[PDB]
Design a protein around this ligand. Structure first.
Ligand SMILES: CC1(C)CC([C@@H](Nc2ccc(-n3cnc(C(F)(F)F)c3)nc2)c2ccc(C(=O)NCCC(=O)O)cc2)C1
Length: 423
């Protein structure tokens, strides 16, 4: 039946956006409700959810305007359609930053963490403590002798020092120091059990302290190390502030403690980067959607601009989305090469955020960007192509699932909340 076909798909479409809207509002409530979930990774999710929520609001508003000159001829329809067009480009660009964020997350590590905290020295320097240092926090000896410090450095570099050491030589010594740090931890009775239990992020925080203080130095934090092993992050965060370490070097300690508390690199992120994501997710769509709207109002205005079959006016909304999809697939491929490298090299376990976030993002990219690429320059079996409306409707639901409901961190919050209720 012809009429039966169009009505049945209308149901699965509206229930698709009904299940998506609900799931996204609930998911967004979860990310906001629990304090522990307040990190840059989840904030990016909340903006991606909003773009799906607003898209659903367009669908419900269009449908709600059917109840009471026709709706096709009205200007209200063109506005709701223009808002819808905005949400779609927002989905694709918030998906872009979702990939860009992931890529940078895979590129940061302990070496990048220490290069920020320790800084870089080109020449030998006698620090406040009496120790001669160079490179990236490479302490030599406390011996008050620049003559012997240069010689002590000569043996530990290979060639004659003179005093000036190149950027490459410093990176070489930097690798030495970090490898020597992890060997210290694993050769310590009090540091191995906790290090083995920490995630890759909180491992870097533990290496960071050993890099500053020392193997036997950080082993003194008996009080903090125990509650770190027990997954009790927040209790250890306040405990680490009551330290000699925190009062001596406060700016560095607060960054390390945040990394312990949250398990993220937020304490090393620049604030302007997240403002550049919000300029891409919400800003760039505005840059091609409004000129599309203007030409389709001055030069092609006929039934909420549904008959988009004339001139270059189709291309100004389809080429920026194609651009977002091509890059999304380029990130898709690049990320996969990085993840399989880090997994093979035992740099990453399948238990880490970087891998689990890749597990979800690598799913959404070909899920949302495949259609746009396959039919790139086609303007426009009937029943079979009617199925695109099913996937686009459920799209928001799947985003809520992969980025919230199956997230391990949120599941911890529900069990931790249920535990408080009993005790
Ligand atoms: C819809 C489905 C049928 C498809 C989905 C499935 N997709 C998926 C699964 C695994 C790999 N994968 C493994 N290794 C690599 C490699 F090669 F290294 F890149 C990729 N890739 C893609 C999925 C499963 C598990 C999760 C998941 O737990 N998320 C929560 C993590 C988070 O968000 O915090 C997400 C998606 C389930």
């Amino acid at each position: 039946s012809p009429e039966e076909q169009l009505l049945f798909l209308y149901i699965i479409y509206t229930v698709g956006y009904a299940l998506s809207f609900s799931a996204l509002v609930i998911a967004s409530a979860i990310l906001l409700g629990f304090r522990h979930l307040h990190c840059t990774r989840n904030y990016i999710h909340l903006n991606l959810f909003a773009s799906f929520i607003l898209r659903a609001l367009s669908v419900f508003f269009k449908d709600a305007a059917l109840k009471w000159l026709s709706y096709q001829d009205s200007l209200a329809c063109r506005l709701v359609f223009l808002l819808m067009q905005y949400c779609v480009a927002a989905n694709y660009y918030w998906l872009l930053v979702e990939g860009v964020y992931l890529y940078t997350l895979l590129a940061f590590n302990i070496f990048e963490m220490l290069r920020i905290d320790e800084g870089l020295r080109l020449k030998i320097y006698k620090d406040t403590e009496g120790y001669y240092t160079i490179g990236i926090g490479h302490l030599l000896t406390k011996s008050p002798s620049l003559n012997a410090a240069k010689s002590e450095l000569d043996k530990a570099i290979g060639r004659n020092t003179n005093g000036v050491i190149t950027k490459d030589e410093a990176e070489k010594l930097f690798n030495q120091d970090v490898d020597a740090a992890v060997r210290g931890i694993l050769r310590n009775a009090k540091l191995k059990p906790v290090y083995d239990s920490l995630d890759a992020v909180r491992r870097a925080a533990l290496i960071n302290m050993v890099f500053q203080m020392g193997e036997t130095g950080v082993a003194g934090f008996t009080n903090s190390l125990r509650m770190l092993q027990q997954k009790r992050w927040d209790e250890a965060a306040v405990n680490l502030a009551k330290s000699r370490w925190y009062n001596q070097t406060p700016n560095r300690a607060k960054r390390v403690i945040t990394t312990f508390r949250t398990g993220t690199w937020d304490a090393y992120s620049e604030q302007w980067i997240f403002r550049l994501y919000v300029a891409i997710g919400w800003g760039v769509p505005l840059l091609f959607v409004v000129p599309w709207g203007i030409v389709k109002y001055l030069y092609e205005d006929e039934g909420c601009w549904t008959r988009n079959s004339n001139m270059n006016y189709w291309l100004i909304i389809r080429l920026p989305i194609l651009f977002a999809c091509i890059v999304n697939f380029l990130i898709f491929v690049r990320v996969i090469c990085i993840v399989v490298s880090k997994l093979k090299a035992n740099l990453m376990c399948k238990t880490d955020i970087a891998f689990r976030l890749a597990k979800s993002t690598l799913t959404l990219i070909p899920l949302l960007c495949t259609h746009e690429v396959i039919f790139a320059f086609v303007m426009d079996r009937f029943i079979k192509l009617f199925t695109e409306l099913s996937f686009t409707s459920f799209q928001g639901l799947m985003v809520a699932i992969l980025y919230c409901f199956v997230n391990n961190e949120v599941q911890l919050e529900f069990r931790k909340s249920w535990e408080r209720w009993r005790l």
